[PDB]
Enzyme design. Sequence first.
Site, short mmCIF file in Angstrom:
data_model
loop_
_atom_site.label_atom_id
_atom_site.label_comp_id
_atom_site.label_asym_id
_atom_site.label_seq_id
_atom_site.Cartn_x
_atom_site.Cartn_y
_atom_site.Cartn_z
N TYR A 1 0.86 -1.06 -0.10
CA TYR A 1 -0.03 0.13 0.04
C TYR A 1 0.95 1.46 -0.03
CZ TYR A 1 -4.14 -2.54 0.49
OH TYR A 1 -5.48 -3.62 0.33
N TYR B 1 -11.76 -7.30 6.67
CA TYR B 1 -10.93 -7.20 5.78
C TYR B 1 -10.30 -8.82 5.39
CZ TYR B 1 -6.09 -6.89 3.35
OH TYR B 1 -5.24 -6.95 2.53
N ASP C 1 -13.09 -16.45 8.13
CA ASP C 1 -11.80 -16.12 7.48
C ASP C 1 -10.90 -15.90 9.04
OD1 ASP C 1 -9.48 -14.96 6.81
OD2 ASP C 1 -10.48 -13.30 5.73
N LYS D 1 -1.76 -16.81 7.48
CA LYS D 1 -0.50 -16.02 7.86
C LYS D 1 0.36 -16.77 8.99
CE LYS D 1 -2.07 -10.96 7.86
NZ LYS D 1 -3.44 -11.28 7.06
O1 6SR Z 1 4.15 -5.62 6.05
C1 6SR Z 1 3.17 -5.82 5.36
C2 6SR Z 1 2.68 -7.01 4.79
C3 6SR Z 1 1.02 -6.80 4.54
C4 6SR Z 1 0.87 -5.40 4.90
C5 6SR Z 1 -0.41 -4.87 5.01
C6 6SR Z 1 -0.38 -3.49 5.49
N1 6SR Z 1 -1.65 -3.09 5.55
C7 6SR Z 1 -1.60 -1.40 5.37
C8 6SR Z 1 -2.78 -1.13 4.48
N2 6SR Z 1 -4.29 -1.68 4.81
C9 6SR Z 1 -5.20 -0.93 4.55
O2 6SR Z 1 -5.05 0.17 4.72
C10 6SR Z 1 -6.69 -1.58 4.40
C11 6SR Z 1 -6.98 -2.07 3.11
C12 6SR Z 1 -8.28 -2.53 2.89
C13 6SR Z 1 -8.94 -2.48 4.04
C14 6SR Z 1 -8.69 -2.12 5.24
C15 6SR Z 1 -7.28 -1.66 5.61
O3 6SR Z 1 -9.41 -2.43 6.47
C16 6SR Z 1 -10.73 -2.98 5.43
O4 6SR Z 1 -10.36 -3.18 4.30
C17 6SR Z 1 -4.03 -2.95 4.99
C18 6SR Z 1 -2.63 -3.47 4.71
C19 6SR Z 1 0.67 -2.92 6.17
C20 6SR Z 1 1.84 -3.63 6.01
C21 6SR Z 1 1.95 -4.95 5.71
C1 PLP Z 2 -3.85 -10.81 6.14
C2 PLP Z 2 -5.21 -11.26 5.68
C3 PLP Z 2 -5.85 -11.82 4.56
C4 PLP Z 2 -4.77 -11.82 3.17
O1 PLP Z 2 -3.67 -12.45 3.26
P1 PLP Z 2 -2.32 -12.40 2.21
O2 PLP Z 2 -1.59 -13.53 2.62
O3 PLP Z 2 -2.16 -10.85 2.38
O4 PLP Z 2 -3.10 -12.57 0.81
C5 PLP Z 2 -7.03 -12.17 4.35
N1 PLP Z 2 -7.89 -12.38 5.40
C6 PLP Z 2 -7.56 -11.93 6.59
C7 PLP Z 2 -8.35 -12.19 7.77
C8 PLP Z 2 -6.33 -11.23 6.81
O5 PLP Z 2 -5.75 -11.06 8.41
#
Ligand code: 6SR
Ligand code: PLP
Lengths: 429, 429
Positions: free
Chosen positions: A19, A151, A248, A277
């Site tokens: 992101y 999410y 989930d 995860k």
């Molecule tokens: O270090 C990592 C690996 C994956 C990751 C996701 C991260 N997040 C930051 C940005 N994100 C979001 O803002 C986000 C996107 C979609 C959503 C949400 C939050 O809530 C409902 O639907 C969720 C993903 C931050 C760090 C890292």
């Molecule tokens: C992190 C997460 C996902 C997505 O998994 P990825 O390995 O990032 O594709 C889906 N559902 C839930 C509840 C999660 O916490």
Amino acid sequence: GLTPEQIIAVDGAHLWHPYSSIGREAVSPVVAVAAHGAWLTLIRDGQPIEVLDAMSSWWTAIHGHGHPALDQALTTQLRVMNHVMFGGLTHEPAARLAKLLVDITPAGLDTVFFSDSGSVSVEVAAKMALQYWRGRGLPGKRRLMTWRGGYHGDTFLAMSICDPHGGMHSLWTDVLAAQVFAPQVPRDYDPAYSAAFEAQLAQHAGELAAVVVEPVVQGAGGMRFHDPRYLHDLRDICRRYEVLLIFDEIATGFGRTGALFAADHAGVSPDIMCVGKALTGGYLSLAATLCTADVAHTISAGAAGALMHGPTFMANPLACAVSVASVELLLGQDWRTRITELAAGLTAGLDTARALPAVTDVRVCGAIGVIECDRPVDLAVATPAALDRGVWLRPFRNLVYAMPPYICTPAEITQITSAMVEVARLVGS
Amino acid sequence: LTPEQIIAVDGAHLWHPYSSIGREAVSPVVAVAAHGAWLTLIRDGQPIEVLDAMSSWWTAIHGHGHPALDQALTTQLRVMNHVMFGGLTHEPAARLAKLLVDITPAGLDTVFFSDSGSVSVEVAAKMALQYWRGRGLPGKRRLMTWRGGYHGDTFLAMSICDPHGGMHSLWTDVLAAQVFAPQVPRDYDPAYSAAFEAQLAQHAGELAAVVVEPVVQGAGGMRFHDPRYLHDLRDICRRYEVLLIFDEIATGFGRTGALFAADHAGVSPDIMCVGKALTGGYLSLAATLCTADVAHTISAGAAGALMHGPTFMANPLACAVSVASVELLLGQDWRTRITELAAGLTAGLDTARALPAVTDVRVCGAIGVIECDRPVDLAVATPAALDRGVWLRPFRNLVYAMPPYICTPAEITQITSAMVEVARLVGSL
Ligand SMILES: O=C1CCc2cc(N3CCN(C(=O)c4ccc5c(c4)OCO5)CC3)ccc21
Ligand SMILES: *Cc1c(COP(=O)(O)O)cnc(C)c1O
Ligand SMILES: O=C1CCc2cc(N3CCN(C(=O)c4ccc5c(c4)OCO5)CC3)ccc21
Ligand SMILES: *Cc1c(COP(=O)(O)O)cnc(C)c1O
């Protein structure tokens, strides 16, 4: 081989992050050079420093990094078979892992579809649910229903059930499937929310394939907890209206919330369940979708005759082998006491934050601790502040939170929470 | 577990690619080891060694258990298994991104790491959509392709797969409705390109991108087409302001005789996906690359970032072995090696042309195909190839192989001899 400045220079020019932008990053990423147990070695001002991985590297490193049982399982499997295609072949690491997963998951989940990421496993769950109803002659049952705040990943079907505000659905007008959203599920139990969930579900039942929720703990959408009795009501609503129930547990799995699976807090079995995860102990990408024999046999008897999905690296021997060891390691110790001790350390260490002026809530659920603030947390302040106190912390929106590894000593947990309190204090000044 | 226990666990609990539970015509074969170009399988209860003619579904380009790749994995295991890519970077990711940016067609300057091919395709689509939203044109949200393609199993990926191969009849009212041109022919015909341009023209205002497999279409039918078709697409897309996405997830890393199949046409896409052979068949990993113009436009738009980020993004273990696999290919005369394999395939399969049920035999790099007039019966073909020391998995009417690059002439003659025999059993009944 690259020096830290060479890495930063490559990374600034050529590497997208989660992101993130290219070229418009407010703060550079910190170079990581080692990870062992609960500790990361990061490069700060050209100097290597050891800090606690309070995020478990995004919910993954439940046993810490470089655990000898998991290193050993990896290298052992590497000696015999790195990978073979799963089409027409089977192998011991898949069979062992699947036998483990069907035995320890909520009752009735008897088949296992391996894939490579949580998002894909969510799509696989949706595909199972859709094909199940087409196998029943009801192809109109093709929409999904959830409650706000959730999410479920970043692929386009996963996005469609993420929180519309949190998931920036305004950016995807006329692109995402239009799903059914119930209001945010409250923390405390309130039989009137359940009655209104059923009332909303009842007018969409004939077009609903499945209800999809994160059980007990919503992660990326707000680090919110909710009373597990809500899942008991969801199980009853879904049974009576003939909509499948999908849990989930990609974030909540493998002990993280104080139960082995968060569905265990309610005694509920979903028809379909995703895990991910922590499945490998943070070593490798792996995920799994489980369904009941009923779902599997209906899909298999339908006009397709099969589940129309098959990842290239399905059931990868290396990933499965380390996962077998991570799951066995967890079940071989008294994990529930471990988690309870982690929870009480988080609760004790975070209590002082309640009196901080910018803090609106503190809450702990298993090995999850959240400081909820009244303003968005500035990462350019928070991240170096926590590094100064020997902790890797990654705030999101207005939350300072931790999901630390299960191998954290009580002194280490106190160091984590102390850095969280001091980040919270800086927020309010 | 013993092989009999594996098969029993498997039949009860394990999904396979595009398979059923409980209705499989034939049990999978238990694989117990894999080294070099050879798998060790269990037939009649005994371990037998057979050639991995499929490279384990395109992955094992260096064979299994290559000592250089085993050692790169174990080396990285000692230092850092995984850290989160949110806020951190590391040397395996920088090293791999620098490699990929320099060896891919000119202009692809940023790298988004993900865990599977299907996810990397959704990322590319997300890249294209956010590009045009950042240029003020949110109507440009549909995808165009030619028929016969395969791009993965997630729902947006499914929407640009061939409608028949991808069984879109099972998905009526579910998939996004995309724009399909006719099947791209084998031989170059400028009238095909004119008709593609005319179709694209009347959709140009609603199209984000054209997405195609360059030169070789894989799971959709193992078909080859003149590279001049890709030159035409680059021109059409340029002139009509539609992005061009090449899906090189099966054609990458030397498989078709060029490093990437785009190099046969000398054209650069705006976005490019890679995956299956990226880690040398060891671990799940994929990458989506885009130009600086695409990256800057996404980052300067209203969202200010690319709205994607998987948990295991840029995994150090997978990136380390991928760096070793890539440098291993680049450190030898791969172009000669692929030329020798293509010649071995053509000489070995020529005699199939005479068989009464063979309608075509075609070779392209390390890919050989026998197309039959009837469907190939797996219950007959697979044991028939096994009894000759070769693992083949036919599909529909196709007997085909994509052998490891390390195959010797004797191994190729053995593989092709097995392929000829399977086709001989087709025209017999
Ligand atoms: O270090 C990592 C690996 C994956 C990751 C996701 C991260 N997040 C930051 C940005 N994100 C979001 O803002 C986000 C996107 C979609 C959503 C949400 C939050 O809530 C409902 O639907 C969720 C993903 C931050 C760090 C890292
Ligand atoms: C992190 C997460 C996902 C997505 O998994 P990825 O390995 O990032 O594709 C889906 N559902 C839930 C509840 C999660 O916490
Ligand atoms: O061993 C493996 C790993 C992945 C895999 C896919 C396999 N395939 C078997 C079935 N396949 C298909 O029939 C198929 C599916 C979708 C399509 C398509 C073909 O053409 C356009 O869209 C393609 C997937 C077979 C074996 C294996
Ligand atoms: C195999 C393949 C994919 C999907 O990759 P997975 O890793 O199986 O999700 C996408 N596109 C093409 C061209 C492929 O060959």
